[PDB]
Structures are given as C-alpha cells and as structure tokens.
C-alpha cells in the first residue's frame, strides 16, 4: 500500500503564467492560474540571524524557527 492524492490534479488541464505580473491581465477570467516555474529556496540563505550566532545558541535559535 502506497497513497497519493489527485485532489489538485483531477480535471486534466492547467493554465500557467510566465510571470507573477501577468495575473493582473484584464482579459483573463476568474480561475486558478499557476506560475510555471518552482521557487527554489535554501534555509541557510534565508535565516541570516543564525549565520552570526555560534555553538548551542545557533542550534536553539533554529529549533525555535523549525
């Protein structure tokens, strides 16, 4: 047994945009439009505060975040 849901991929079609700015386009319609590319994010880069902390202080800060 191995579960996986098609709840967001049920219809067999998808409308996609190259740019978030495109969503404002007047001649669109009410509906769901997906930005075409995935956003890719490292946590090391995102959390600056832990970068300048040291030892167990760094560790406990991250724990509070996670």
């Amino acid at each position: 047994a191995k579960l996986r849901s098609m709840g967001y991929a049920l219809t067999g079609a998808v409308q996609t945009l190259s740019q978030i700015s495109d969503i404002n386009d007047e001649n669109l319609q009410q509906g769901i439009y997906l930005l075409r590319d995935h956003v890719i994010t490292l946590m090391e880069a995102t959390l600056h505060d832990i970068s300048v902390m040291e030892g167990m202080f760094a560790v406990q800060h991250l724990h509070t975040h996670l």
Binding site: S5, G7, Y8, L10, T11
Partner: protein, 98 residues
C-alpha cells in the same frame, strides 16, 4: 455537473479510547544536567509557569476506567521516580570518625 473535492474522505470502523498519565519531576532533570541551586530555581519557575497556565483553562472530566492507584505500572514507576537510588546503611554499632 461536478466540481473537485480535494480533501480525503475516511469511513469509520470503530474508535479506540486510551488514557495516558504523564508524570514530571524537576529533581530527576536537575541531577542529569548537573544544575546548580540557582538554575534549579529557574527550572522550577519555568515548569510551574507552563503547567499552571494549562491548569487555569481546563475543567475536570470523569473517565470510566479504574483508579491508577490500583495499577502496578503506576505503583512501580512512582516508587522509582522518587526512591530509585535511595539506600539506608546500618553500622554494626555506632562509631564516628576519630
């Protein structure tokens, strides 16, 4: 016509009921962490703060099971948490360091 229903649907078979008792004791914690008498105060404050806050919003409910005081596991674990490493030595007869 039809629209998606993304959320899963679960059919019930039965419900299992459980009772768990959690026991907390700050001295056990303070021994292992080599805490000083000053930090033992901080630990004691911090634990009471959290426990009291929970206590202040929750009323009491009757649960239809027998009393924990009658159950071995309760007895064994309570005696342990309290007395595990406590011993009494008797001299043959009373003699001090000279």
């Amino acid at each position: 016509y039809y629209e998606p229903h993304p959320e899963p649907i679960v059919v019930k078979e039965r419900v299992l009921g459980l009772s768990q008792i959690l026991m907390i004791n700050s001295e056990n914690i303070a021994n292992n962490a080599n805490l000083t008498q000053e930090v033992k105060k901080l630990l004691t404050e911090m634990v009471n703060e959290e426990m009291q806050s929970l206590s202040d919003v929750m009323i009491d409910f009757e649960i239809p099971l027998g009393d924990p005081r009658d159950q071995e596991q309760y007895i064994h674990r309570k005696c342990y948490q309290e007395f595990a490493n406590c011993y009494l030595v008797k001299y043959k007869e009373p003699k001090p360091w000279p």
